[PDB]
Symmetry: C2
Subunit: 989 residues, 2 copies
């Protein structure tokens, strides 16, 4: 019979396995003197919900448009109220039946009218730098062709179609296409024409493509230069000029430059160059560097490098995949300001303007092809496009466009085939194509662990233990002896590690110590630089970030997209502050006697001449001595002992016992760089003279007994509970043991291995740790000193339905001024629940005070938070912050803000100050309870309740990285145990 | 030092392991002519949150009461706004550290002033029939003693304390005590004085206790009678008179009554009797019956009985544990009206007034002691009071009070030691005590499967398969050969089975067929008679039932307390309607040729003389023939073939082919009984002449094609989707395949055994079955007949992220009057998800119509819902219900309301009727979507949205009983498969 369905042709094109049609050959993105017109601006836009109903109403001509409205281009259209962003991690948001598309498939019709002056004749092209995911392009109603590879560029010849004067450009964009099955990156799905649209004249006798080859001979110091130039695919006559090197050579000929200063991320030397034909001139920045693998090490200019990396997606919280150039420049400077020297373009080529900035600012870049088929994994990889010969041409096209665009950039030191795309014949074909086209850059691909088609062995989230075995070259053999031998000779990179989601990441120091120890380890790229929060505004006026499921998604992955070192506005998370310190390129170990410091230069190429070395001694009152010490430049990978001025050690010699003082030595930029100002701190080291343990008060005040209350100096207790009700007039609503905290993103992750794979959060809920109850066993007053008394309150803490508990005894003493509180914790019964041992989050006290706190001051580590396996960036000192600044604005609220290693704290509660001292404790202060924090899914759910929740922890567990990869390392776990700890409390007006 | 804690003495008493102090010896509850004053009424009540702050302000004297307000007694105080009800199933709501109590422990001080006239002197007592959980009792300020065993009675001698005229009775009640650790029944925690408080005079020369022994010799027909009577524990001179039997005998002497009519649940013959001393007369109802175990069968009066049982808790949705007498009488009549002959008093003795009613109405009662320590099980039973010698006296006291109170009742045929209290020495001591005190009733206790200390082997929720092996006596041996031999010689009872929570229970017929087949099987007691809903009223005016967690509980078990055959107001759930039919005591199998019926009398004692046998033939128009047929009485366990009048078979002979007609034969009560009126239906059977398969319309209308719509007779289709948009003017908003339903309580239960223990609900969510998407493959018009056409719409249904799907083809045809719809379903790919095969809930269609439905009519099974493993009570006929009456008011909304076995349906949508016909289908109609139904936690969450959701299922899965015990039996499971089915649709005005 007769077919009656609508849209069949549009759908058949969307279901194509081929690369797009009609485009010019892939080439470099080049700075040319050829005339150009950017078509970016306000376009006209109409959205249809699917191909079947998308109108065929001749809209391409731009006459009498029915249902179009203004939209900026470039754009990701769901950022501008057209549908909604949708987030999945692995799962596809559509039925998995390639190459077919869902019926619900946003179709966005875009139209711009522009003027073409005489300079665009007779030859010109239209360039599109990215369209997600399938574009069909018409110019004055004439089909140019189609685009596939959402993050890749396409150019269309418009000679003889483009007209003098007015022209109408129309682009139909489908969100979903067969291409969406190979674009399954863990990020928002965001259709749109989201990168530049450019008219470019193509003058006769021009230059279409250029391939710079600029090697460095590290023995002789020569540059090895050849600049290819072609037109229409053929090598052409052109002149290359490099004025700084006193060179003029023909394009196409290799020459030896007697002396070049080589390019590295540390020293990003670039020589300005031009390659000219009669009709066109191309401007280039040439960095001379050669990359080799030698002795299972990845070497640049003859040296093994350490990659201090991050994975950079392109995201903006208001504009989606469109990242303004000011934001790109600012975030790169921010990375350099945090000691980052390497970037993986996870998992697609970046905006083409990225590459010049990386060459300039200095980063080793793993430039990754736009390919990911991760959602095929849950079906055993059945139908995976990576191994389906019908997709070979589409996947080789993606690799070809990736490589041709960026091949001239010194910053690019590896090509990556894609990410989490399984193994298969089309990956092998992409690698073959790349090795043949550009043998000058090693190939990377983590998805095939046998490493058959790559030149480095790459893994994601391998544990510190497996990374140590790999660094020693003693990881288990592959089955194939030939592949085993090849992989053993490769250097090893963590392309994603220390997942930075929420409170964390824990365990960074342990990987970094291995990276320093084993030359085969190249380093690692943190996952990930940024959180992909999307700003959501509420009717009152407050912004917060939204995450997966905040936009009506049927299927999504919640806050797994907010897993970065910075928020979407590039504000640092504590993890970035810690990472900067972990990867610092100099090591400064300050002598205990303050006579000097050991300085290790951990850079690969630069000496220490860029740095000014500063010292300062700080005490209670402020700075006591400081200055700058002159250091003869130290070679990369060498170290020296720098003497400090004698006045410094004399100051340390003369300090009274138990007066606290901190000597800090810092390496700062001696002069402005391209990425920071003079004075910018790169590295530091300290030596601390610790305050003496507080003297517990003499127990000279006796206990005053009333019918319902007991008084001991400035403490009033409920006689019914044994718990304080005020301390020097500050109301105490509650005091009790804590063992739990509001789970972090990591604690919500599965604990892989062994019989128990409940996330720690679930282990804790099952155990009742979040719902502890206290039974009073007794209250005794005992003899102290000179008629004074101590008061001991004996309690047992447990939870409904559990037989295990802890005995907690509080002993209060006071001389009328300060209050001594000794806490003793003893395990009672076996802490096992559901067949598994229970772990604690902490051993601590929670004081709920009945007044708000405005300010929190402390001597300890800071200014930012620190847990046992984090806080590397938190240094010793005296800190003071408004209460709200103690918090951490994670998108999903969770345990955060603890300051470990506190020696003393002071809370300002209006006119009164509550001072806490003792052996080291962790300090946290909040205006809402742990139950409020745990329940909150977004920051607007946190409401101050007029109280202060003060946490003083004798022990804390680490935070690890269990949301993705290793949980808390063995040394930072917290098994139930007996504990004893003393505090002093003093309320001052 | 000096102790300073408060409340230590009250707490030490609450933590006592002893039974209460000061009470008179346990005895029978007896109807005496001794004067009595009920103190029930408005008392004065003050609540303190714990012992430490409960005032010692001399309130016992009732003078100048500070902070008391009026409260009815008996009461469960949290039903009257004093704190809140709290529900846990197994878990204790307090830390498990017996005998200690939590600090938060509601203390309720109760006070009543009353007058004692001269008739209460010189001797009297105060009787308390239940206090939860610990009472301390003062009279005029003088301590009487304490109560333990919340559901047991205590009496205190008040001689010389009670005063002529005004007296003040004070009772301090603690919710929690050491006793709460042995009162862990799955029900609400509800402190209070929740049973009668009675002053009773004790005249000199009276009767304190009586023990009736009334056996029956089934061979001779003699009664064996001995009535013991004692005072102060000593046997006394008393006269027993039984006027109906022409007897006067001395108390204490056993006599042989030559002829007695024996008591059974079927024939509850009771002889009025009195036992008299000079000072007191006690009124008794004597049922003669003897109980024995013989040949591994439980026999009463020489016959094996079948128990058709339920577990009865005491609950009222507004008064808590106080069940008004009118409610008790009405619910027992309701049980008898549903063929129930047996009751287990789960898990404590009932109100003492229960027992006379069970004797009278006729039920075999398992009278269970107030003991349950289930929350010790999760710690391996460590510290279980059942095996701790410190608790022996408290537990033997509980068994002694249980047995002494009820020992005179013929209805009591087993004593049960308690429930889910593990194994141990104190259970053995309770059993020893009981066997010695009353060897006339077998002992029951399920918790020790070795059955060492009991006389019947009892299990809860054993599968139909294990029950079959037990019925054949071939279950696996115990390790001990001596215990094995004893247990093999016991008859077997399911003390809980076919858990009745939500939609269900499924699988009842299969247990009942075993009960009939194997004499060793005693029958079973459904869990449970009632839902324990608590009425919650909202500010507008609407009531709904609340469940666990609706009352602010920190820990609770949600809707596991709403798991009954009736709701808390005793309104039947569909499961009761089904159970009545499953346990019907007569079997009526109607001959296919309508000449007669086979009648089996499945009663144990009664013949069929109580019943009138009625027949009726019903067709389309109504009744065609009917009457009453005389049946000579059939003996218990015999059967006969009853001929129907010849006019009936002649009517069947003459019916036109495929005209539907139903012959129903019913056994109804011929006369009013104590529990129902004449005409009450006890049993039925049918024979159906099935309507002929509908003639599909001739496909004579062609397809009309427009740009955006196709028309085929009265059907309009979207041309873009292929789906109908109206049928004869009724708007169709949506039509598509269904495979899922909103999970029942059972589907939320774990699927025990094998590698997969996800509840089915979780299996379905994981599989994406609740979020199906449909892709259109094509639409063709094909040649029908005489220029008409059929329209085939080909689609594929699957879910985001899944590779499996089903191909669904719709073929529409019409002659302009009726519409033929053929649906073809074919599996595409392997339906496995997370390593396990996916199961479907159904194979069906959902029509979302854009108008409301007022009425639903059908020919099929009803009136109530039916699924493949339920609906036994739904008979063949013609039904018609207002839309809201199609629904089932489960407390947690869930899949329900499907009418399986429908042959035709008619929906009234204002002025139009939509008629559906075909091969048998299940029919459901709702005013809200499945997503709304699934999300709803309570009935007020269901909101009509102005649409009709119509479900027509070609297949359904069973509902089973997986919330507790067996899931869906193999024969009712639904594995993905190909299907084909035809419907006809007709819209009439
Ligand atoms: Na992520
Ligand atoms: Na229950």
């Amino acid at each position: 019979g007769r077919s009656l369905e609508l849209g069949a042709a549009d759908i058949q094109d969307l279901e194509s396995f081929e690369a797009g049609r009609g485009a010019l050959p892939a080439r470099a993105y080049l700075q040319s003197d050829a005339p150009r017109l950017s078509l970016n601006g306000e376009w006209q836009f109409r959205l249809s919900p699917g191909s079947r109903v998308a109108p065929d109403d001749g809209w391409q001509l731009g006459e009498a448009l029915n249902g179009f409205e203004s939209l900026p281009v470039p754009s990701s259209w769901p950022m501008h109220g057209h549908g909604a962003p949708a987030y999945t991690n692995v799962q596809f948001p559509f039925a998995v039946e390639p190459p077919h598309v869902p019926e619900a498939n946003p179709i966005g019709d875009h139209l711009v009218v522009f003027e073409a002056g005489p300079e665009f004749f007779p030859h010109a092209l239209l360039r599109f730098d990215g369209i997600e995911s399938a574009g069909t392009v018409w110019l004055n109603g004439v089909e140019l062709g189609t685009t596939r590879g959402s993050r890749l560029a396409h150019e269309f010849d418009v000679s003889g179609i483009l007209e003098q004067g007015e022209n109408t450009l129309a682009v139909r964009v489908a969100q979903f296409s067969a291409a969406s099955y190979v674009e399954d990156q863990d990020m928002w799905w965001l259709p749109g024409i989201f990168r530049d649209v450019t008219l470019q004249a193509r003058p006769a006798a021009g230059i279409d493509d250029v391939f710079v080859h600029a090697g460095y001979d590290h023995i002789t110091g020569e540059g090895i230069l050849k600049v290819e130039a072609s037109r229409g695919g053929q090598a052409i006559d052109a002149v290359v000029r490099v004025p700084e090197l006193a060179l003029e050579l023909a394009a196409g000929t290799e020459v030896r430059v007697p002396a070049v200063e080589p390019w590295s991320a540390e020293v990003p030397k670039l020589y300005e160059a031009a390659v000219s034909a009669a009709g066109e001139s191309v401007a280039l920045q040439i960095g001379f560097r050669s990359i080799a693998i030698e002795d299972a090490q990845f070497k640049v200019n003859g040296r093994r490098i350490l990659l201090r990396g991050v994975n950079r997606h392109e995201h903006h919280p208001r504009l989606g995949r469109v990242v303004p150039r000011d934001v790109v420049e600012a975030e790169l400077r921010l990375m350099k300001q945090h000691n980052i020297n390497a970037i993986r373009t996870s998992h697609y080529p970046p905006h083409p303007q990225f590459l010049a900035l990386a060459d300039q600012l200095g980063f080793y870049v793993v430039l990754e092809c736009d390919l990911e088929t991760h959602g095929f994994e849950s079906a055993g990889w059945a139908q995976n496009p990576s191994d389906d010969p019908q997709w070979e041409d589409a996947l080789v096209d993606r690799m070809r466009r990736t490589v041709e665009r960026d091949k001239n950039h010194a910053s690019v030191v590896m090509w990556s085939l894609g990410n989490e795309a399984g193994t298969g014949r089309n990956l092998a074909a992409m690698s073959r194509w790349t090795k043949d086209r550009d043998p000058s850059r090693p190939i990377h691909y983590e998805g095939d662990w046998s490493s058959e088609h790559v030149d480095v062995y790459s893994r994601m989230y391998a544990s510190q233990a497996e990374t140590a075995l790999i660094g020693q070259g003693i990881e288990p053999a592959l089955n194939d002896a030939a592949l085993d031998a090849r992989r053993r000779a490769m250097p090893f990179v963590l392309c994603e590690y220390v997942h930075a989601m929420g409170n964390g990441p824990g365990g960074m120091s342990e990987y970094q110590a291995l990276f320093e120890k084993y030359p085969r380890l190249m380093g690692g790229f943190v996952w990930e630089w940024l959180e992909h929060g999307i700003t959501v505004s509420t009717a009152d006026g407050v912004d917060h970030y939204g995450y997966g499921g905040d936009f009506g998604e049927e299927v999504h992955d919640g806050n797994f997209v907010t897993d970065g070192l910075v928020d979407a506005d590039r504000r640092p998370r504590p993890g970035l502050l810690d990472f900067k310190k972990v990867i610092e390129p100099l090591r400064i170990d300050v002598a205990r006697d303050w006579t000097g410091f050991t300085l290790r230069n951990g850079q690969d190429f630069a000496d220490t001449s860029a740095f000014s070395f500063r010292y300062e001694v700080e005490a209670d009152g402020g700075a006591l001595d400081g200055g700058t010490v002159d250091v003869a430049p130290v070679a990369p990978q060498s170290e020296t002992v720098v003497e400090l001025p004698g006045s410094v050690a004399a100051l340390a010699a003369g300090l009274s016992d138990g007066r606290p003082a901190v000597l800090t030595v810092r390496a700062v930029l001696g002069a402005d760089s391209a990425w920071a100002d003079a004075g910018h701190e790169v590295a530091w080291g300290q030596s601390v003279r610790e305050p003496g343990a507080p003297v517990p008060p003499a127990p000279v005040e006796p206990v005053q007994v009333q019918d319902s209350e007991l008084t001991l100096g400035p403490v009033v207790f409920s006689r019914a509970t044994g718990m304080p009700t005020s301390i020097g007039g500050v109301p105490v609503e509650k005091l009790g043991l804590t063992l739990w905290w509001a789970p972090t993103d990591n604690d919500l992750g599965r604990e892989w291995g062994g019989a128990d794979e409940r996330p720690l959060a679930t282990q804790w809920k099952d155990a009742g740790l979040n719902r502890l109850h206290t039974r009073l066993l007794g209250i005794s007053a005992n003899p102290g000193q000179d008629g004074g008394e101590t008061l001991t309150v004996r309690t047992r803490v447990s939870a409904a339905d559990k037989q295990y508990g802890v005995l907690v005894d509080y002993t209060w003493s006071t001389d009328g001024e300060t209050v001594g509180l000794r806490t003793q914790v003893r395990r009672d019964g076996t802490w096992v629940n559901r067949g598994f041992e229970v772990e604690w989050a902490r051993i601590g006290l929670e004081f709920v005070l009945g007044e708000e706190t405005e300010l929190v001051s402390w001597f300890g580590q800071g200014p930012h938070q620190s847990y046992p396996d984090t806080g590397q960036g938190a240094r010793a000192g005296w800190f003071s912050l408004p209460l709200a600044k103690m918090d951490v604005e994670y998108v999903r609220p969770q345990e955060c803000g603890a300051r470990s290693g506190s020696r003393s704290a002071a809370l300002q509660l209006g006119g009164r100050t509550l001072e806490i001292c003792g052996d080291p404790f962790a300090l946290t202060v909040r205006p809402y309870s742990q139950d409020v924090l745990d329940a909150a899914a977004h920051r607007p759910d946190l409401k101050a309740d007029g109280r202060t929740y003060l946490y003083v922890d004798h022990a804390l567990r680490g935070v690890g990285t269990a949301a993705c990869g290793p949980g808390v390392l063995e040394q930072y776990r917290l098994k139930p145990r007996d504990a004893d700890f003393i505090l002093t409390l003093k309320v001052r007006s």
